[PDB]
Design a binder for these strands. Sequence first.
RNA 1: GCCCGGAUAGCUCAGUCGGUAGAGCAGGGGAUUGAAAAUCCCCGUGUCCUUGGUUCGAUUCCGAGUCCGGGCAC
Length: 306
Amino acid sequence: LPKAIFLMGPTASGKTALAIELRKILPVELISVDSALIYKGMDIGTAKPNAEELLAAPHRLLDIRDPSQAYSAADFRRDALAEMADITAAGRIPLLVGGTMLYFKALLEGLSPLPSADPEVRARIEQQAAEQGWESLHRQLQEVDPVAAARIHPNDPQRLSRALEVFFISGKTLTELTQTSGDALPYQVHQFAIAPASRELLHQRIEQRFHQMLASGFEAEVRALFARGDLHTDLPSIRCVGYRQMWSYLEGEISYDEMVYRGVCATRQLAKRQITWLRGWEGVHWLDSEKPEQARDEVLQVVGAI
RNA sequence: GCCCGGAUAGCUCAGUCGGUAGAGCAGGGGAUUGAAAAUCCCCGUGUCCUUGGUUCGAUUCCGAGUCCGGGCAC
Ligand SMILES: CC(C)=CCSP(=O)(O)OP(=O)(O)O
Ligand SMILES: [Mg+2]
Ligand SMILES: [Mg+2]
Ligand SMILES: [Mg+2]
Ligand SMILES: [Mg+2]
Ligand SMILES: [Mg+2]
Ligand SMILES: [Mg+2]
Ligand SMILES: [Mg+2]
Ligand SMILES: [Mg+2]
């Protein structure tokens, strides 16, 4: 029953700022919960904390992967669980910060044990999609696993592929394996979420931030990655907001102004979904991004003196 | 100044053989089990620029005006 804290929220909501200020009055250790902040070489477009901030409040799970190697909610849970052990062992409290809700979820509720990605069976699945389309595959999932087929739309290639893969590797069906639940988070968690008071203020912060990045050398950053010649748009790292658009720009597929428009929109759409996650998330205490930055107090009281 | 194209949803544009119109994108909402900053599902009434003409009826054809891209001329 050790204690732990979750500081969630959408992009540009001031989560990072709040976390280090918290480090000041609480015996907490910061753990990053961000699918993009894991990449080495992706610092400005991901809004990664700078070296000074990191000096004040160290973050675990940052720069732990090369943009060419995919991560997963499963890998995060493992790494996260291990980092928490180490932290609580030191008599301090784990403060998980980020905007990647699926990771928070996988960590909190666990994950049904399932086979990991198998590049070979995926390549085959992709192959059959090009020849017969994803419909042929969805009709096949329909035969072996109807429960999953009803949930997964025939237009959802990632989930469709995933449901077939599990079956092709184990022979066991996805709905059958998911009947076994994953290990819940053996911690007492206090979940907070911070966001601006209105959707429009969020949009302004998003657009403004995107320009601060361009002005901080974002383009050059993405070019360094473009120059490696080994990264492609089917990699989680390149599909990240901002990066994907900038990649289209370096490929000469779109103009600069077009890239800036799409990156901003892409970031707003991301925020929209993040808010969808938080809405209905159980046990969430809401805090305000805007000036009520002194929301640390609401944290101080909910978690109480430790 | 003259000629040729545009002018229709927040933006880019389709369309209406004359019977008041629809895609994409933007935006909104919802899903979410080893790619998740990903992948996918649902939501489209707008003085069809203005004004005359013809017409039962015009955003739609014709005339003129206005604004916007070009071209010719100085
Ligand atoms: C989505 C983009 C472009 C950057 C990541 S932003 P973030 O989640 O770090 O936002 P805050 O930490 O809340 O400022
Ligand atoms: Mg941050
Ligand atoms: Mg227009
Ligand atoms: Mg037209
Ligand atoms: Mg008709
Ligand atoms: Mg309509
Ligand atoms: Mg949209
Ligand atoms: Mg008329
Ligand atoms: Mg007319």
